[PDB]
Paper text:
NSP13 contains 5 domains, a N-terminal Zinc binding domain (ZBD) that coordinates 3 structural Zinc ions, a helical “stalk” domain, a beta-barrel 1B domain and two “RecA like” helicase subdomains 1 A and 2 A that contain the residues responsible for nucleotide binding and hydrolysis. A long 30 amino acid linker that does not adopt any secondary structure links the 1B to the 1A and 2A RecA-like core helicase domains.
In the nucleotide bound form, AMP-PNP is bound to all 4 molecules in the asymmetric unit but in two distinctly different modes. In mode A (exemplified by chain A of the nucleotide form) both AMP-PNP and a hydrated Mg2+ ion are bound, with the adenine base making stacking interactions to H290 on one side and R442 on the other. The β-phosphate is situated directly within the phosphate binding motif I and makes interactions with the main chain amides of residues 287–289. The Mg2+ ion is in an octahedral coordination and makes direct contacts to both the β and γ phosphates as well as the side chain of S289 and additional three waters. The conserved D374 and E375 from motif II (walker B) make further interactions with the waters and are poised to perform their presumed catalytic role of activating a hydroxyl for nucleophilic attack. In nucleotide binding mode B (chains B, C and D of the nucleotide form) the interaction environment of the adenine base and γ-phosphate are largely unchanged, with the ribose O2 contacting the side chain of K320. No density could be observed for Mg2+ ions in these three chains with the sidechain of S289 contacting instead the α-phosphate and the residues from motif II more distant. More directly related to the nucleotide status is the relative conformations adopted by the 1A and 2A domains which shifts by around 20° and adopts a closed conformation the Mg2+ AMP-PNP bound crystals structure, and a more open conformation in the APO, Phosphate bound and other AMP-PNP bound chains.
Residue numbers in the entry: 2 to 203, 208 to 593
The structure:
C-alpha cells in the first residue's frame, strides 16, 4: 500500500509490467493499462484468474467473485469488472483523483530509451515523474547489461594478462578501461566476489581491485549496481534569504578569490545556486575559494566522475589546510585516484567524493561540479544523502555529458541533460563566469566562435604555440576502438622539432590510439573523459578518424580547452580543421 505516482492518491495497486513497479491509483492504473501493453497489476495479491488451470493475468479480462478473481471465460453471471468505466478495483477505490498528464507517464514507462525525445520528456515532465524517469532509465540501463555474456577464465598467462572464454549465444562487451567487470570464485553452493576488474586487448590485459591469483573457472560479468527508489527531488524548493545564514564570512581574502566575493555572498543568501562557466573560466577555482570565504563552514565537494573530483582535490591541495581535507573512496576498489588527502575520513571539514559513493551526512555548503555529466538520478542522490544549507551547482552544459549509452538516434540538447542544466538554459544561472583564465587566445577564439556564441572572453593573450595540421593518415581498427599510426608518426617527427613538447599530454577520442601513441611517443596520455576539469601546459591531439564520435563538438571542445600554453591538433575532418583558429603546418 502506497501513494500514486501521478496523483499521490493512496492506493494498493502497482503495475507489474513496469520494470519499476510504481504505485498507481485506480484511474491512473486504468489509464495506463488501456493505452499501453502493460496489463499486469500487483495489489496485495496479483490480479489473476482463480480458475483451476487458467493463465489470465491481464487485468482487462478479470472479474470479481466472492473473495477471488476470474477471467472473462471462467466468471459467474453475477460478477463485475475489476477495471471498467475508467477505474480499477482496489483498496482506496474511492480516493482516486485522476491525472491529466498520464500521456507522459505512458511514454516514460514504455520507451526503450533509444531516442533523444525519451530523455527530453524525462526532464520536461513533473518533478514526481523526473524521479520515476531516472529510476526507469537506470534500471533499463542496468537490465541491458544482462544481454552480454559471461566471460570465464580460460588460461592465466601471467599477472596482468589472461585468456578469456565467452558464454555462447550472447555478445561481448567492449574491452577498455571504461567498462568495469566483477570477478567471482565458484564455491560449493554459491558464488563469492573476487573484486573489480578491467580488461584491454594486448590474449587480454587485466588489472584488478585485488591481487587474487585467479585460476581457471572464475568468471567476469559487467558490474551491475542497485537501482534505488528515488525520494528527494532533483532540486529542493528554492528559498531566498535576506542575509547570510549559518555562515560567518572571512575578514581578509586572497587576491585570487577576491573577484567572486559578490557571488560568494549570493551562495549564502539562497537555498541553491547555479554557476555556469565556459571552459577554463575558473568554475572549480570558484568552488575552492568558497571554502576560504566561509572558513567555519563545512563543504562537501562532489562530482560524477573520479577525474572531476580529483581536479577539485588538486586545487584544494594548494589552497586549503591539508589536514582538514578528505577523499571518500568506496571500499575495495583499487581505482587509482588522488591520495594526498586522508582517505575515507567522512567527518572532515572538506569532503571530496563521487556522487554514487556519497555518505549520508550533513554539510553547510554542497558543491556539485561538472554538472553537464550529471543526471536527474544523481541530483536526487545528492539531496537524499547530503542534507545541507546551500547547494552550489557548477558546470558547463557545452562540455561532457553523462554517458547515455542506450541513447542512439537523435540529438539531445544540453538543456535536457538534467534539471540543473535545464535551469541554465531557460531562466539563466544564478552566477556566471564569462572570462577564460586558462587557455591561450587562439584556443579561446576557436571555442568562442564554435560553441559559445562569440560571448567568451580571453584573459590570456595569443601564445603563438597553437598549431593545426590536416592529415587523414591511415586508419586501422581493432574491435571497438581505432588507431591512426601515420598521425602519430606526424607527432613523432614534430616532437623532435619541438623538444618542449615531450612533457605534453596526448589527447585522442580513442584509447587504443592513446595506447599506441603511448608506446611510440611515450607521452602522458589522457582521454577526453579522463581529462575533465584538468589543465596541461602542452596538449597534443590526434583526431584519428572522421567518425561521428571523433567529430563531437563537445568532446572536441573539452579536449582542446585543456591546454593552457600550446596545443597541436592533428585533424582528419576538414570541417573542424578550418574552424580551428590555429596556425597551419606543412607536410614533410
Ligand atoms: N581569480 C583567479 N586567480 C588566479 N587564477 C585563476 C583565477 N580564476 C581562474 N584561475 C586559473 O585559471 C584556470 C582555470 O580555472 P578552473 O577552475 O580549473 O577552470 P574551470 O572553470 O574549472 N574550467 P573546467 O576545466 O571546464 O572546469 C586554473 O589554472 C585556475 O588556477
Ligand atoms: Mg572545473
Ligand atoms: Zn506499466
Ligand atoms: Zn493516479
Ligand atoms: Zn480463467
Amino acid at each position: 500500500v502506497g501513494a500514486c505516482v501521478l496523483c499521490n492518491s493512496q492506493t494498493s495497486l502497482r503495475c507489474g509490467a513496469c520494470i519499476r513497479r510504481p504505485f498507481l491509483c485506480c484511474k491512473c492504473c486504468y489509464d495506463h493499462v488501456i493505452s499501453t501493453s502493460h496489463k499486469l497489476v500487483l495489489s496485495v495479491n496479483p490480479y489473476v484468474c482463480n480458475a483451476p488451470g487458467c493463465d489470465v493475468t491481464d487485468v482487462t479480462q478479470l472479474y470479481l467473485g466472492g473473495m477471488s478473481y476470474y477471467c472473462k471465460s471462467h466468471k459467474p453471471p453475477i460478477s463485475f469488472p475489476l477495471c471498467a468505466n475508467g477505474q480499477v478495483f482496489g483498496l482506496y477505490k474511492n480516493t482516486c483523483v485522476g491525472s491529466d498528464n498520464v500521456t507522459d507517464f505512458n511514454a516514460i514507462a514504455t520507451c526503450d530509451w533509444t531516442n533523444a525525445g525519451d530523455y527530453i520528456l524525462a526532464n520536461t515532465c513533473t518533478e514526481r515523474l523526473k524521479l520515476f524517469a531516472a529510476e526507469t532509465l537506470k534500471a533499463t540501463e542496468e537490465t541491458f547489461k544482462l544481454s552480454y555474456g559471461i566471460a570465464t577464465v580460460r588460461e592465466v598467462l601471467s599477472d596482468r594478462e589472461l585468456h578469456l572464454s565467452w558464454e555462447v549465444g550472447k555478445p561481448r562487451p567492449p574491452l577498455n578501461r571504461n567498462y568495469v567487470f566483477t570477478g567471482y570464485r565458484v564455491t560449493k553452493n554459491s558464488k563469492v566476489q573476487i573484486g573489480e576488474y578491467t580488461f584491454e586487448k594486448g590474449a587480454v590485459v587485466y588489472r584488478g581491485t585485488t591481487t587474487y591469483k585467479l585460476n581457471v573457472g572464475d568468471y567476469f560479468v559487467l558490474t551491475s549496481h542497485t537501482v534505488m527508489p528515488l525520494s528527494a527531488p532533483t532540486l529542493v524548493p528554492q528559498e531566498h534569504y535576506v542575509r547570510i545564514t549559518g555562515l560567518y564570512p572571512t575578514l581578509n581574502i586572497s587576491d585570487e578569490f577576491s573577484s567572486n566575493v559578490a557571488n560568494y555572498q549570493k551562495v549564502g543568501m539562497q537555498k541553491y545556486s547555479t554557476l555556469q562557466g565556459p571552459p577554463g573560466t575558473g568554475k572549480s577555482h570558484f568552488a575552492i575559494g568558497l571554502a576560504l570565504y566561509y572558513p567555519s563552514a563545512r563543504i562537501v565537494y562532489t562530482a560524477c566522475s573520479h577525474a572531476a573530483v580529483d581536479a577539485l582535490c588538486e586545487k584544494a591541495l594548494k589552497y586549503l589546510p591539508i589536514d582538514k581535507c578528505s577523499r571518500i573512496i568506496p571500499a575495495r576498489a583499487r581505482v587509482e585516484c588522488f591520495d594526498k588527502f586522508k582517505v575515507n575520513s567522512t567527518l572532515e571539514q572538506y569532503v571530496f567524493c563521487t556522487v554514487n559513493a556519497l555518505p549520508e551526512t550533513t554539510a553547510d555548503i554542497v558543491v556539485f561540479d561538472e554538472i553537464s555529466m550529471a543526471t536527474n538520478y544523481d541530483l536526487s542522490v545528492v539531496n537524499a544523502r547530503l542534507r545541507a544549507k546551500h547547494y552550489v551547482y557548477i558546470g558547463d552544459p557545452a562540455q561532457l555529458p553523462a554517458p547515455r549509452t542506450l541513447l542512439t538516434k537523435g540529438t539531445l540538447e544540453p538543456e535536457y541533460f538534467n534539471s540543473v542544466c535545464r535551469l541554465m538554459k531557460t531562466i539563466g544561472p544564478d552566477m556566471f563566469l564569462g572570462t577564460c583564465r586558462r587557455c591561450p587566445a587562439e584556443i579561446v577564439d576557436t571555442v568562442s566562435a564554435l560553441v559559445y556564441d562569440n560571448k567568451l572572453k580571453a584573459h590570456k593573450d595569443k601564445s603563438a604555440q597553437c598549431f593545426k595540421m590536416f592529415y587523414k593518415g591511415v586508419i586501422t581498427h581493432d574491435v571497438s576502438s581505432a588507431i591512426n599510426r601515420p598521425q602519430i608518426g606526424v607527432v613523432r617527427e614534430f616532437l623532435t622539432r619541438n623538444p618542449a613538447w615531450r612533457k605534453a599530454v596526448f589527447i585522442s577520442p580513442y584509447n587504443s590510439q592513446n595506447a599506441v601513441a603511448s608506446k611510440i611517443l611515450g607521452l602522458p596520455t589522457q582521454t577526453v573523459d579522463s581529462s575533465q576539469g584538468s589543465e596541461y601546459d602542452y596538449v597534443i591531439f590526434t583526431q584519428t578518424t572522421e567518425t561521428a564520435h571523433s567529430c563531437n563538438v563537445n568532446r572536441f571542445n573539452v579536449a582542446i580547452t585543456r591546454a593552457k600554453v600550446g596545443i597541436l591538433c592533428i585533424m582528419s575532418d576538414r570541417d573542424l580543421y578550418d574552424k580551428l583558429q590555429f596556425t597551419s603546418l606543412e607536410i614533410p
